[PDB]
Write an enzyme that holds these catalytic residues in place. Sequence first.
Site, PDB file in Angstrom:
ATOM      1  N   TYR A 165      13.023   3.254  19.699  1.00 28.48           N
ATOM      2  CA  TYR A 165      12.360   3.176  21.140  1.00 28.48           C
ATOM      3  C   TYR A 165      13.464   2.837  22.118  1.00 28.48           C
ATOM      4  CZ  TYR A 165       7.467   2.369  19.186  1.00 28.48           C
ATOM      5  OH  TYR A 165       6.448   2.376  18.591  1.00 28.48           O
ATOM      6  N   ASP A 187       3.837   9.445  13.134  1.00 26.95           N
ATOM      7  CA  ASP A 187       4.367   8.920  14.227  1.00 26.95           C
ATOM      8  C   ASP A 187       5.880   9.180  14.481  1.00 26.95           C
ATOM      9  OD1 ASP A 187       3.684   6.397  15.757  1.00 26.95           O
ATOM     10  OD2 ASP A 187       5.509   5.675  15.097  1.00 26.95           O
ATOM     11  N   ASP A 196     -11.692   9.205 -26.503  1.00 30.26           N
ATOM     12  CA  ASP A 196     -11.131  10.392 -27.210  1.00 30.26           C
ATOM     13  C   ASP A 196     -10.502  11.221 -26.185  1.00 30.26           C
ATOM     14  OD1 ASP A 196     -10.225  12.165 -29.178  1.00 30.26           O
ATOM     15  OD2 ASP A 196     -12.330  12.956 -29.655  1.00 30.26           O
ATOM     16  N   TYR A 242       3.817  -0.670  26.240  1.00 31.59           N
ATOM     17  CA  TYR A 242       4.170  -1.399  25.169  1.00 31.59           C
ATOM     18  C   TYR A 242       5.592  -0.865  24.934  1.00 31.59           C
ATOM     19  CZ  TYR A 242       3.618   2.853  22.518  1.00 31.59           C
ATOM     20  OH  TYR A 242       3.545   4.259  21.990  1.00 31.59           O
ATOM     21  N   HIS A 272      -4.661   5.717  14.089  1.00 32.30           N
ATOM     22  CA  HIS A 272      -3.390   5.747  14.072  1.00 32.30           C
ATOM     23  C   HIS A 272      -2.893   5.994  12.635  1.00 32.30           C
ATOM     24  CE1 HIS A 272       0.908   6.042  15.403  1.00 32.30           C
ATOM     25  NE2 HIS A 272       1.264   4.895  14.682  1.00 32.30           N
ATOM     26  N   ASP A 289      -9.959  15.109 -26.548  1.00 32.86           N
ATOM     27  CA  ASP A 289     -10.915  16.429 -26.758  1.00 32.86           C
ATOM     28  C   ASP A 289     -12.354  16.321 -26.747  1.00 32.86           C
ATOM     29  OD1 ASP A 289     -10.182  19.632 -27.037  1.00 32.86           O
ATOM     30  OD2 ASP A 289     -11.542  19.293 -28.972  1.00 32.86           O
ATOM     31  N   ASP A 299     -16.664  12.727 -29.447  1.00 37.21           N
ATOM     32  CA  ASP A 299     -17.664  13.641 -29.453  1.00 37.21           C
ATOM     33  C   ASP A 299     -17.945  13.950 -30.864  1.00 37.21           C
ATOM     34  OD1 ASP A 299     -14.765  14.569 -29.534  1.00 37.21           O
ATOM     35  OD2 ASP A 299     -15.633  16.626 -28.892  1.00 37.21           O
ATOM     36  N   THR A 311      -6.431   9.803 -29.863  1.00 40.15           N
ATOM     37  CA  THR A 311      -6.391  11.283 -30.216  1.00 40.15           C
ATOM     38  C   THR A 311      -6.064  11.638 -31.459  1.00 40.15           C
ATOM     39  OG1 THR A 311      -6.283  13.283 -29.296  1.00 40.15           O
ATOM     40  CG2 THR A 311      -4.871  11.523 -28.073  1.00 40.15           C
ATOM     41  N   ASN A 312      -6.496  12.729 -31.887  1.00 38.86           N
ATOM     42  CA  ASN A 312      -6.082  13.506 -32.958  1.00 38.86           C
ATOM     43  C   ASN A 312      -5.489  14.764 -32.466  1.00 38.86           C
ATOM     44  OD1 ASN A 312      -7.012  11.732 -35.112  1.00 38.86           O
ATOM     45  ND2 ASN A 312      -8.395  13.249 -36.129  1.00 38.86           N
TER      46      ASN A 312
HETATM   47  O1  LIG Z   1       5.125   4.183  19.809  1.00 39.22           O
HETATM   48  C1  LIG Z   1       4.557   5.152  19.137  1.00 39.22           C
HETATM   49  N1  LIG Z   1       3.811   4.980  18.192  1.00 39.22           N
HETATM   50  C2  LIG Z   1       3.356   3.371  17.957  1.00 39.22           C
HETATM   51  C3  LIG Z   1       3.380   3.007  16.576  1.00 39.22           C
HETATM   52  C4  LIG Z   1       2.972   1.763  16.272  1.00 39.22           C
HETATM   53  C5  LIG Z   1       2.463   1.139  17.308  1.00 39.22           C
HETATM   54  C6  LIG Z   1       2.290   1.536  18.392  1.00 39.22           C
HETATM   55  C7  LIG Z   1       2.702   3.011  18.748  1.00 39.22           C
HETATM   56  C8  LIG Z   1       1.747   0.507  19.384  1.00 39.22           C
HETATM   57  C9  LIG Z   1       1.239   0.605  20.737  1.00 39.22           C
HETATM   58  C10 LIG Z   1       0.660  -0.458  21.388  1.00 39.22           C
HETATM   59  C11 LIG Z   1       0.446  -1.776  20.412  1.00 39.22           C
HETATM   60  C12 LIG Z   1       0.734  -1.613  19.328  1.00 39.22           C
HETATM   61  C13 LIG Z   1       1.505  -0.732  18.697  1.00 39.22           C
HETATM   62  S1  LIG Z   1       1.982  -0.658  16.907  1.00 39.22           S
HETATM   63  O2  LIG Z   1       3.134  -1.520  17.082  1.00 39.22           O
HETATM   64  O3  LIG Z   1       0.850  -0.685  16.184  1.00 39.22           O
HETATM   65  N2  LIG Z   1       4.758   6.570  19.479  1.00 39.22           N
HETATM   66  C14 LIG Z   1       5.612   6.956  20.312  1.00 39.22           C
HETATM   67  C15 LIG Z   1       6.979   7.834  19.722  1.00 39.22           C
HETATM   68  C16 LIG Z   1       6.250   8.891  19.000  1.00 39.22           C
HETATM   69  F1  LIG Z   1       5.699   9.828  19.903  1.00 39.22           F
HETATM   70  F2  LIG Z   1       7.243   9.563  18.148  1.00 39.22           F
HETATM   71  C17 LIG Z   1       5.078   8.318  17.872  1.00 39.22           C
HETATM   72  C18 LIG Z   1       4.235   7.313  18.613  1.00 39.22           C
END
Ligand SMILES: O=C(Nc1ccc2c(c1)-c1ccccc1S2(=O)=O)N1CCC(F)(F)CC1
Lengths: 546, 546
Positions: A465, A334, A8, A382, A523, A10, A184, A122-123
Amino acid sequence: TLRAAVFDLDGVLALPAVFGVLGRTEEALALPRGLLNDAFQKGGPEGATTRLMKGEITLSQWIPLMEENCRKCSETAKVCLPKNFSIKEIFDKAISARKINRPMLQAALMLRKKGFTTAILTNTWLDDRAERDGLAQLMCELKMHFDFLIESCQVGMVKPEPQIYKFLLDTLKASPSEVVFLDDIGANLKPARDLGMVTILVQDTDTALKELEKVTGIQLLNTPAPLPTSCNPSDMSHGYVTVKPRVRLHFVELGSGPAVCLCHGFPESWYSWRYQIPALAQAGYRVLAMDMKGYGESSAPPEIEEYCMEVLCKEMVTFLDKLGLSQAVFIGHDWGGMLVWYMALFYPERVRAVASLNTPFIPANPNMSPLESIKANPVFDYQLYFQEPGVAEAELEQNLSRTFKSLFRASDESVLSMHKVCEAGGLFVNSPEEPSLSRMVTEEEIQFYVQQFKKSGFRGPLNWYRNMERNWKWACKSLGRKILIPALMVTAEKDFVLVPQMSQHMEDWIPHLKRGHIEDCGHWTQMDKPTEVNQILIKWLDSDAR
Amino acid sequence: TLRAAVFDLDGVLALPAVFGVLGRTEEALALPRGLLNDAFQKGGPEGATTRLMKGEITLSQWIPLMEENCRKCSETAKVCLPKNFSIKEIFDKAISARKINRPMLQAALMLRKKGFTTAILTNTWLDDRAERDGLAQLMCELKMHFDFLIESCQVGMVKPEPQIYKFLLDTLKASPSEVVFLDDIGANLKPARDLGMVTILVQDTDTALKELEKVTGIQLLNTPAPLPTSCNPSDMSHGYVTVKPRVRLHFVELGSGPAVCLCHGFPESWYSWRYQIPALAQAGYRVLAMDMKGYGESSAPPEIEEYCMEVLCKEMVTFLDKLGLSQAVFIGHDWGGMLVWYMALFYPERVRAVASLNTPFIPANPNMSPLESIKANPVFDYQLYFQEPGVAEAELEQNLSRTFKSLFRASDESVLSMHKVCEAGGLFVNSPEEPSLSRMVTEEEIQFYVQQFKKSGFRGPLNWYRNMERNWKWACKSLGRKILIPALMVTAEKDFVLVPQMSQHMEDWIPHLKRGHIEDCGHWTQMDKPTEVNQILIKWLDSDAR
Ligand SMILES: O=C(Nc1ccc2c(c1)-c1ccccc1S2(=O)=O)N1CCC(F)(F)CC1
Ligand SMILES: O=C(Nc1ccc2c(c1)-c1ccccc1S2(=O)=O)N1CCC(F)(F)CC1
């Protein structure tokens, strides 16, 4: 065996019960006991209230009929109503005071999660009051969580008439022994019981839930804190804006109120905000969850230059232009967090407020190039692996399910070394071919990212990147500026790419900066700690962003 | 010969000029003449103002630097600033008082219409004030109407530096002799002239426009009232919501504020609201212009029952559910107008306000079936022709361009007999194969409807007429109700399908009904009288719909 739960509204899904306010008014006004309650049910099935609940008349047409019944009832009891007596005023207050019974909803949510078909029976009335929106909002929040909503005023039937029970049974496609019905009002419980349904008279919630758990064999009481409401991609409003001839931006949209533009990181989706979208819309905001350029249903042009900060920010301004939005609150995580600080620096008039999850604001060093600044402070190794077009794409696209399963992990689940990527020759070299499923994600959620990334792959995402020098040169133009619009920095204790300590000097450039911090959070902030994210964002939005 | 027109913002496209308020403050405060103006330009190209206009610093960082310059200027003139002197307060007011110079915009719009490339070239700042949105709104409304917006703080260059003129020339892809440049500052006009550009010193608008028309050879002054801004379909935000497994609803979305849901008639499109969408968004509303079920990018299931009022209204509620909207103002025309009255009757809690163009609210006669009520009052003979599935579809789909050219005509352009359709055997029997282009539409606008109708044809649209008995039975449940939420009825003098007289008894069912009337207006209200529609709707929305 039970497979359907009916509730219900209410006194069951919503509290305090609107009915019980008639008695409260009698006590407060020192009127004879049951007078208002008697005027309310006057004429029984032929009376104004039954006609209202069947939908023959609206709530506003009913108000003067209830007032007439109130006079006739007082006349027989040889009493008088006070000078300022108003049925509208009494119901306006009663309806406004009525809120969702959270533990009852959580039980209904758990039953549906365990395979039950759930329904609200419901009513109710056709609310045409000037203040009808409060009730419209209550019904919207509630209904989404159930398979069916059967309203008396819509079906032209009323409880306890046996017709409505047969209608409910047919809507449910279930025999009465498969149904648990919670109410109720004992009288409204009677026909369901007489049909063979398991019935629960609801007085206090706790007892009703003990009865419900005993009868279903499912734990509903004292159970852990559930996750916030998520998003089913096919039930969302999907929006598409062309920002330039080769670029279209996709977004998911929910809610009304100030526009909140959500900007994901790498390698993500609008779906990374699944736990924030319903919460933020519920908190009174118009959420616009983006698929950033290079991702999902958004365009992914191949050129590296299409992904420099200047172009991305300009396109987000164009996005606002085409949607007719003079401003939006910008919330990024991020790479999205980096974009949001640059939107605040270069377009403050278009940014109502700025918030970043994990990504700090660090001004550019006009002496050192970022292609050389890496590596200096920690090890962004990376990022160097991400530079050469085609290399990281090949590894990240080889097995999509493995990619997202390996990346989307909580702080205590790492199968990935953050660095030594450009020595080992890849992000996944010391990682399994079949990673385990992180506690943060279901198999279904991983498969959504898999399907999303099948369209354009990792070229566009990795191109974010590949503009280090371009972004630095553009960021150097903003060196004399300060961020003076409302700003929120949210740090994540266990983010090893974005360590909370990186954000320490931010107050030098954003003096009025507000903060948030999440402990035991990696993260993937949004899915790691959704409840905490929502409470930090909702609190900040209600205080600093209209 | 000229092919590009460039306009300044302050003193040219926007009035009163923000600069001229420094002199106004001097006069009001009885300060020495030119004191505030001198403190503003203090240090020339090395000063705080130039740094602000180049984008080195934001407006909020500049305010205390201007205050310091104001003290130094008063000190030399041996005077003092008043007790409550505030630069922020002065500029907040000056910026807020500054509005678009409508005749200057109309001239720019006419030049672009005649093939000119138009641009705004301005010396502006990065506005991070708490009140920055007012300016953000001004810029948004203005910029949409031009090919380019060059802002000093974005390009890091300033007027009168020769660099900005060379940048402008390059953005324009035009030689200086092809360019007319309009400015209120003679100094900023000088480098454009020195380059070979036709320059106009703008003091009063009228003289500037006489100069502009003499030099371009295009009439810009005393010219007729232009049509409201229309929509270019590819520059719109397109939204898609799945309301049930086989049904998806498409909509165009523009603006922020209370949600305004626009519902077209037969055989139309979201595009029938092209002249209302920009106007309503500009008036402070979030416009959602639908492609109704059976039309354009919305689903068109074949079944007749999919188009009864009950189903259509239920799906519009689901549409609101999925978008997270507790309410929307519902504005309908023709069959959309009929839908909106039924939304108000059956779902008043979801309807903030209801407005209908041409379609009156006439309650169902519970004694007479509508399949027999036609014909009784006038002659709805064409409705009988629409009943048999496949017949009207064949004629309406044979030649799409002929269909829309024949139907979309003003009151004094009729090539169609309203009735005697089921005697003559078709809507187009006495109509030409190649109809003339109505004064209401361009060839391009007809071709948009042609392309839209190529997807699903006329089956779904005609199915709206094929549920007469179903709709009547459902409407009979609402006979005891009254519409008591805010409501607007707009009649069109020369609509022969929907004669204004049909609406005369509406006050019996909608007592607080508000009205509008458009003279010399046919059935296609939105495109026939766009200016009048917009003023009636905007006035009613601002008064009755939040
Ligand atoms: O590179 C990033 N983040 C980021 C996002 C996703 C991954 C990584 C890093 C990463 C780093 C190492 C291994 C695997 C991975 S992942 O692919 O899981 N940043 C630089 C630019 C920023 F500052 F804007 C935000 C942070
Ligand atoms: O049929 C309509 N309108 C309507 C819409 C479009 C056309 C006609 C009528 C019509 C009538 C005769 C010839 C050609 C045409 S046409 O194809 O130009 N109405 C009934 C239901 C309503 F009351 F909801 C709205 C009004």
